[PDB]
Amino acid sequence: DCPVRLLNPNIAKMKEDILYHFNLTTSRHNFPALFGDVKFVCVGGSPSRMKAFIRCVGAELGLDCPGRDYPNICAGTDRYAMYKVGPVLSVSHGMGIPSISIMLHELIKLLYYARCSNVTIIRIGTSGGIGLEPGTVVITEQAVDTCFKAEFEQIVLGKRVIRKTDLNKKLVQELLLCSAELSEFTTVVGNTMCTLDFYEGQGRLDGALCSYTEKDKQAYLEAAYAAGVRNIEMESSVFAAMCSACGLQAAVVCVTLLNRLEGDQISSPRNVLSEYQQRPQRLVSYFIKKKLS
Amino acid sequence: DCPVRLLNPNIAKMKEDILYHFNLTTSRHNFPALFGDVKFVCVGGSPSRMKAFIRCVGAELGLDCPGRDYPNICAGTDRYAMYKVGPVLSVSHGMGIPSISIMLHELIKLLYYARCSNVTIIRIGTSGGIGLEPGTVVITEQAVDTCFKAEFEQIVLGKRVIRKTDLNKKLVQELLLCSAELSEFTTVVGNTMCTLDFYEGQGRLDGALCSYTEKDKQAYLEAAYAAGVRNIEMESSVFAAMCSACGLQAAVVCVTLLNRLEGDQISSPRNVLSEYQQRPQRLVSYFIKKKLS
Numbered sequence: 001d002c003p004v005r006l007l008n009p010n011i012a013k014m015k016e017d018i019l020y021h022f023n024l025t026t027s028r029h030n031f032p033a034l035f036g037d038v039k040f041v042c043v044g045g046s047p048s049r050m051k052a053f054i055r056c057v058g059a060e061l062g063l064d065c066p067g068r069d070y071p072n073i074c075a076g077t078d079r080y081a082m083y084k085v086g087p088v089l090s091v092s093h094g095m096g097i098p099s100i101s102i103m104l105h106e107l108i109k110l111l112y113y114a115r116c117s118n119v120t121i122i123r124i125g126t127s128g129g130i131g132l133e134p135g136t137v138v139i140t141e142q143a144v145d146t147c148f149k150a151e152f153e154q155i156v157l158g159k160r161v162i163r164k165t166d167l168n169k170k171l172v173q174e175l176l177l178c179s180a181e182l183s184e185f186t187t188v189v190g191n192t193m194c195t196l197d198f199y200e201g202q203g204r205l206d207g208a209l210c211s212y213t214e215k216d217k218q219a220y221l222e223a224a225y226a227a228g229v230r231n232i233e234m235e236s237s238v239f240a241a242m243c244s245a246c247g248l249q250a251a252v253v254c255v256t257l258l259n260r261l262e263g264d265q266i267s268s269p270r271n272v273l274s275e276y277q278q279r280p281q282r283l284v285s286y287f288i289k290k291k292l293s
Numbered sequence: 294d295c296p297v298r299l300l301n302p303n304i305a306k307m308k309e310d311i312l313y314h315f316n317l318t319t320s321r322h323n324f325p326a327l328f329g330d331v332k333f334v335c336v337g338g339s340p341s342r343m344k345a346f347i348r349c350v351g352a353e354l355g356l357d358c359p360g361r362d363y364p365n366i367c368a369g370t371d372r373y374a375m376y377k378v379g380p381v382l383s384v385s386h387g388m389g390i391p392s393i394s395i396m397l398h399e400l401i402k403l404l405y406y407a408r409c410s411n412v413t414i415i416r417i418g419t420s421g422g423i424g425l426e427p428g429t430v431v432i433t434e435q436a437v438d439t440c441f442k443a444e445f446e447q448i449v450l451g452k453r454v455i456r457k458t459d460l461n462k463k464l465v466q467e468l469l470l471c472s473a474e475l476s477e478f479t480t481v482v483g484n485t486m487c488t489l490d491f492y493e494g495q496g497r498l499d500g501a502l503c504s505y506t507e508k509d510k511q512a513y514l515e516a517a518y519a520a521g522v523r524n525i526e527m528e529s530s531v532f533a534a535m536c537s538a539c540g541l542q543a544a545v546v547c548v549t550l551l552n553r554l555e556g557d558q559i560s561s562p563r564n565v566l567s568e569y570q571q572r573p574q575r576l577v578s579y580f581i582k583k584k585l586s
């Protein structure tokens with residue numbers, strides 16, 4: 001019903017397209033036959049988390065056959081990993097705007113060549129909370145910049161280009177509904193601030209560099225909280241400004257690993273942090289199951 | 294002689310430090326005993342490229358003993374891989390400014406706790422060339438922004454903070470020296486433009502998004518060429534801005550994978566691309582064997 005579209009008049013004249021970072025080529029691969037049935041894409045930082053995600057949702061849908069694995073569709077490259085089970089695609093994206101950008105440029109063309117339509121895309125990951133207990137799942141209402149505005153800036157040919165961040169409201173609602181049914185963890189809906197640096201960029205005091213005080217930070221965070229911000233991470237803004245523009249329905253679901261009003265160090269036991277990081281997976285695999293039933 | 298320093302008062306007050314992304318902590322690890330003897334750090338995108346590097350410099354230094362390999366010091370995470378042979382450290386950094394910044398904050402802190410001094414740090418990578426044949430090695434004179442200036446801008450508590458990019462001039466001459474001795478491939482010195490996006494960020498026409506034309510790309514790449522730029526990549530600017538400020542001598546050495554005046558697609562056969570990628574490694578590992586002879 002709603003096809004994945006590119007916003008680029010230069011693609012039609014190309015004889016082939018090398019998705020360099022995926023190690024996939026329009027000449028070597030039957031894209032419509034490989035990926036044409038994709039309806040749900042889950043993305044996150046880590047290749048192992050994304051394979052775990054693909055195993056878990058394969059089980060949830062019961063396409064989980066005994067023994068056998070989900071091959072890395074991008075095995076051979078080491079930039080991104082990719083997995084698939086029925087209409088679900090799993091894709092790692094590393095850390096930061098540039099890393100997910102490259103993945104998203106290539107994934108969106110991949111889906112376009114595959115002539116995919118009605119695609120829901122969900123980012124799962126981790127974040128720092130503002131005024132939330134650690135381990136809280138935040139469903140992102142708006143992906144915002146460091147002014148707390150629903151905007152994404154990039155430089156194109158030396159000029160600053162402002163594009164809007166848009167996450168699907170209906171999708172936000174569906175995921176919230178799912179979480180109240182599950183009732184396995186605190187879930188909130190808030191704005192998510194995207195940064196280009198984890199230390200000075202997130203107002204941390206424990207970096208190799210720090211140009212400000214404990215109270216400069218505290219007052220920036222409180223300002224953020226007042227403007228609707230509930231968490232902080234590194235990939236939401238570019239994700240929200242590309243997916244919508246290309247006809248994907250996008251959501252972001254992150255767990256908080258700490259409350260940033262109370263500290264900076266991520267000091268919880270490994271096991272606790274591990275339990276926290278299952279939570280976006282749990283919510284999103286359950287949501288996919290509920291949508292495909 | 295010259296110690297690795299931090300530009301952060303809050304670090305001495307701290308009782309313990311968790312290097313979250315390395316899975317290293319002061320409370321579990323002996324930093325001087327682990328890393329005190331490190332004099333050279335080589336950084337690059339991929340874990341497997343950085344393992345191949347430690348093996349190569351190991352061989353070069355004659356510390357290549359029969360059979361055994363190099364344990365990943367950061368095993369148990371998948372953010373960054375890290376390897377050591379004698380006084381050389383090898384650390385991967387993934388893709389983009391944010392990925393390498395996180396690595397750099399925690400790496401500099403790691404060198405500090407280890408009481409390291411006289412540390413030379415080199416980035417080896419890949420890049421798109423401007424007016425150079427594919428496979429040319431570029432030693433970066435200045436890491437520049439998208440207006441061709443030796444500055445790195447980040448946002449700190451909502452505010453634009455501009456720092457200078459500084460790459461060691463003597464180090465550039467030393468690397469060039471080694472290249473003239475080796476005489477195994479074309480080596481140029483020039484400026485490197487760091488970008489936040491591989492497609493539109495670098496004036497490519499083949500992204501999922503493109504508002505401009507061939508003529509626009511061409512004029513922007515020419516303007517860059519006239520301002521000293523010979524190659525384009527994604528990590529040099531934050532690298533150049535952080536390393537020197539913290540008392541490390543920094544260099545960037547990238548091979549070009551294509552000539553951007555001629556195209557955007559990376560269509561060289563895989564084996565050709567591999568040969569190209571061994572080149573910065575060849576030069577840097579030889580530089581290191583030379584400094585330690």
Ligand SMILES: O=c1[nH]cc(F)c(=O)[nH]1
Pocket residue numbers: 126127128129198202232233234256257258266
């Ligand atoms: O970008 C972030 N990711 C995860 C965190 F815990 C955090 O504080 N910031």
Ligand SMILES: O=c1[nH]cc(F)c(=O)[nH]1
Pocket residue numbers: 419420421422491495525526527549550551559
């Ligand atoms: O950032 C880049 N790395 C490698 C390339 F070939 C290129 O064009 N751009």
